[PDB]
Amino acid sequence: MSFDDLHKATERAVIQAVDQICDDFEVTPEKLDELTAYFIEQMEKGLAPPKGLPMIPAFVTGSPNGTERGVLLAADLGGTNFRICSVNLHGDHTFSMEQMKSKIPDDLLDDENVTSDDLFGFLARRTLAFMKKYHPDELAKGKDAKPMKLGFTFSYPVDQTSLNSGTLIRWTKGFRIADTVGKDVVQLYQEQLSAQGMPMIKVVALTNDTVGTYLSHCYTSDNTDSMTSGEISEPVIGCIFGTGTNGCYMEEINKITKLPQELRDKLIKEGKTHMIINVEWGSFDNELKHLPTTKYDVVIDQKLSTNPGFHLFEKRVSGMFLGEVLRNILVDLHSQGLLLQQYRSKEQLPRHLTTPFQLSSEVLSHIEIDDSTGLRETELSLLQSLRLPTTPTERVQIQKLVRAISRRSAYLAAVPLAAILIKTNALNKRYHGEVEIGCDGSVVEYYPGFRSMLRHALALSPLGAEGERKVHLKIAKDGSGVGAALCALVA
């Protein structure tokens, strides 16, 4: 056929093939029902003694009201940095901030055999510099003063035998230091704090970023938590979607069959009815019994991934992998002759479409909501910020693919929220019963319309579109810094 005839036939075939890839990417409401039911099943398997889900009790039996008073501290430590924050709760749904971001120490931790004393003394040194800098209010009263409660955000593998008690099991995503496999991390931090000179500091909390997100959403609840006035709604889920994904919710105390009955009765004999469970829902259905999977998901999880087959739901939802899936689809369609069709072979393609993760997520951000830009002006430009240029008929299908990837990730992200809301139902305060779930992270906050698709999925779930609209949801953003302080408050 003619060059023009072949071009037209090729464009029609690209229509076909891209629609077929989309069909292979779709999430049906039937699959939604299947996934949420299996998630309820994994939840109930998990928190009973032996496994369904890594549902780790966070040992928090109280939620902030947004009416709270006082000033508290918060320490967080990871491979990223070390941070000492200080929060002054104004007494309304507001607060005031102070903080020092002590950079991760330059190579006292690079797989050298260093003491817990070295690392935790660096932590306490930065805490002492903090106290000296912004207030020696009770630091000048170094012998004794009115104490200060602070929460610790130690985002490492930890065995939290209770609140303000953690027994570190390993340094993963960090580097191995000597003989901390049995130490209590809150105890080490407290020892180093009382050893530099502040004995006023009490380390009374230990939680990770998701429990902090939940507590930071309890505070600052849009005037829907101060009283049963206007909207009558309470927050029941904290969660982070983005580079990673996880969530936490409050479960009945006597429904956590895992914890021994001693602690359960000792809590219920108090005013204590519920406790926060940090559902590790990252790495959900790793066995892939129900979790949808395509070819590109396999080729990325196996070859290009650092966790070969461990956090599968994370990888299907994370913001890093969206652009990666798009890149693999593009390289596929090219090497099979349908797209970018005058780069005569692979390794003639631009340097970023060939190499692994060079297709970032802001690309999909710009592409997904392309307005009628006189047919893909900002989209062409931004997709062309990486070295490859494109044509209109190709850009239409590339937008199709990007939107399909995003919709799948959003519906999957909605599955666990729906399963939690339907396990602990939102229809128990029979009248005006409403529930808001607060969210942090990259994808959920800044990806265009990822919340609209979350809502559409929650409507298409066995959470009924009839009942989805008693759940409105928005963002609570600081969990390592404000959430730790609030976990110290409710300690």
Annotated binding site: 101, 478-483
Rounded CA separation 312/325 (Å): 14
Beta strands in 67-186 (DSSP E): 70-77, 82-89, 95-102, 148-154, 158-162, 165-168
**Active-site hit among 76, 184, 209, 225:** 209
Rounded CA separation 432/470 (Å): 8
Which DSSP category does 251 fall into? E
Catalytic residue list contains 209: yes
CA atoms within 13 A on the CB side of 360: 10
**Active-site hit among 33, 118, 125, 155:** 155
Phi, psi of 73 (to 5 degrees): -115, 170
**Active-site hit among 19, 111, 170, 385:** 170
Rounded CA separation 85/102 (Å): 11
Own/partner pairs for 293-301, CB < 8 Å, 24+ apart?
A: 294/24, 294/25, 296/325, 296/328, 296/329, 296/332, 297/325, 299/328, 300/324, 300/325, 300/328
Which amino acid is located at 390 in the chain? T
CB count within 10 Å of CB 99 equals 15
Beta strands in 128-181 (DSSP E): 148-154, 158-162, 165-168
Rounded CA separation 292/152 (Å): 37
Known binding residues for ATP are 101, 478-483
Distances from the Cα of 480 to the Cαs of 120, 157, 298, 370, 487, in angstroms?
18, 16, 33, 34, 10
Is the separation of the CB atoms in 61 and 267 below 8 Å?
A: yes
Nearest to 366 by CA among 355, 374, 377: 377
Cα dihedral across residues 304, 309, 312, 314: positive or negative: negative
Rounded CA separation 401/25 (Å): 9
Is the separation of the CB atoms in 189 and 198 below 8 Å?
A: no
Catalytic residue list contains 430: no
Bridge pairing between strands 245-252 and 201-206:
unpaired
What are the residues whose beta carbons fall under 8 Å from the beta carbon of 391, sequence distance 6 or more?
A: none
Catalytic residue list contains 455: no
Distances from the Cα of 291 to the Cαs of 29, 39, 283, 287, in angstroms?
14, 10, 11, 8
Bridge pairing between strands 434-440 and 233-241:
parallel
CA atoms within 13 A on the CB side of 285: 20
Give the tokens for residue 350: 């631009």
Is the separation of the CB atoms in 204 and 150 below 8 Å?
A: yes
Give the tokens for residue 62: 């109280």
Q: Which active-site residues does the annotation give?
A: 155, 170, 209
